[PDB]
Symmetry: C3
Subunit: 242 residues, 3 copies
């Protein structure tokens, strides 16, 4: 019961109902021959022919009007279908317009973030590269130190290709053994002795003088002060005393 | 457009035949019936022609209404076609750009991944480095530390050992013959004095001799010690 | 569907009725005009039926044209529906992809920020290591260096000190009693002969005794020296 535009209505079937002339075809023999002119006699029969023909035309026009109407009804159904489909497409397309506009803007936004990221990556590679070179270098210096340093914990003897100077003292076993050079010494004149020497030499001594005895005493002293010159020579050569 | 003439019915120049206006005794009976029947036929035909025109008029009025709706469909469809083709271009472009971003992001993921492995490895190397370094700092001999330093091993040096800058111990001294006898490391008074009298006194001499023997035995003890250290051969 | 026959008029052979072929007094008042008027309304009904026909024909020709447009509109709507659905699919896909990329890029930037911190921290640890290393290089005692090396601290070793491979200093020799008295580090003379006697006559054996004292006093001084260094008790 929706819209009823003027002039609209489905096909009117009555348009097909034919008018049927009920008058019997005119036979000249029923006409007034004495009283009607010949021209009027011809006119009456002619007008009789026309009435019948015009009825044919009117019936045909009605039929043609009906076909047009029936076709209109069918095109109205199609127009309505077309109308529904267009309205839905317009809605679908309007929805797409927005989603496409948002996608395009999300793409532009992603590009900025990736371009930034790319920059950070480039620098990170630069920093890691350089770092690698420094680590390799430090690592070489380390192993180089490890093969050349003196260990406080090594148990096997270690040697130095150089002389050594220490502060205030040397010790072994935790006991001082050597210190600063002992000064205040005057060098011993004379000829040192390092040859044979028997510290268990006895000296006989009698009740009366005896040159033999006393000589062996002063000589054992000479050989003694001399070996003492020797020991001193050795201690000064090292540097333990002045 | 709809022809208005179609809706205007025929105006009959006038009818109203009643059969009392007809001439009697001039028209045969038949022609009489005919004239009345043709009267009603004309009537029925005038109406059929009017109804047909009205039917043709409605069809045309409906055709006009449909031409208007068709015009509207045509415009909306061509505009939808413009909008959809436009969308086609933009969707295609958005799609290709996403593909281009993926190649870049994928490339970036590959570098981030290798960076991670590299830093991870670099991490292992540095720790190992710090550990070797801490070990050294705790086990090397410092030329600068003041606190006494201990070596758990024997030491061997070249040329000499100094303290405060003065040479103290050099190379072992050779040219020695081992002194024989029994060493004396006990009591020894360097201030031991002696009595020398005018006349041979056996006791006084013996004293000297005895004190000489002790002195010689302490000399051997010192020599033994020096030799034991290695200062002399 | 347009039927052209609809446009073909019914020609009524019009010879319009007059009072020139009509009977001279036979039919009355009404019937006279009624036949004149009927001749006119028959001609009018004919015109109306003919135009109604023409109107039906025009509506049909128009219907045929509208059918052509309806089909064209039908085809274009069908194609647009396909295109719009194809677009629905692809747009949703592009939207998915963008989202998927967003999680990847978001993840990546989290990793990048993490690498920047680690690399930063690694730089700190590497710098410190390089500093500890340069400190060691300047402070360690080398086993290969030739120039003399100096320690600011005392040295302690185990079992012995050597020089040139030969032992020179070992553990402190113990068991010594310290010699007492005055130490003599003054002028000495290892070779100062002693003229003896003959007959004991010539007392002065004071020389032998006096030289025995100086000797055992210099022995005491050397002993002090050894004990001061630490080589003996
Ligand atoms: Ca139509
Ligand atoms: Cl899109
Ligand atoms: Xe008619
Ligand atoms: Xe050392
Ligand atoms: Xe030493
Ligand atoms: Xe003596
Ligand atoms: Xe990225
Ligand atoms: Xe390092
Ligand atoms: Xe070191």
């Amino acid at each position: 019961g929706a819209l009823v535009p003027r002039g609209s209505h489905m096909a009117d079937p009555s348009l097909n109902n034919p008018v049927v002339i009920q008058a019997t075809r005119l036979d000249a023999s029923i006409l007034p021959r004495n009283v009607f002119s010949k021209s009027y006699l011809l006119y009456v029969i002619a007008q009789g022919t026309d009435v019948g023909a015009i009825a044919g035309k009117a019936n045909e026009a009605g039929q043609g009007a009906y076909d047009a109407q029936v076709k209109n009804d069918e095109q109205d159904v199609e127009l309505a279908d077309h109308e529904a489909r267009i309205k839905q497409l317009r809605i679908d397309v309007d929805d797409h317009e927005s989603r496409i506009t948002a996608n395009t803007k999300a793409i532009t936004a992603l590009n900025v973030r990736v371009t930034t990221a790319e920059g950070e990556i480039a620098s990170l590679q630069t920093n890691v590269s350089a770092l690698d070179g420094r680590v390799t270098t430090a690592e070489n210096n380390i192993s180089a130190l490890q093969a050349d340093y003196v260990s406080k914990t090594a148990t096997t003897s270690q040697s130095l290709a150089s002389p050594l100077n220490v502060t205030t003292s040397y010790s072994v076993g935790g006991k001082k053994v050597v210190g600063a050079r002992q000064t205040g010494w005057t060098a011993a004149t004379g000829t040192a002795n390092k040859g044979v020497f028997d510290a268990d030499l006895t000296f006989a001594v009698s009740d009366t003088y005896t040159q033999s005895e006393i000589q062996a005493i002063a000589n054992a002293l000479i050989t003694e002060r001399r070996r003492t010159k020797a020991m001193e020579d050795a201690l000064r050569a090292h540097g333990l005393i002045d």
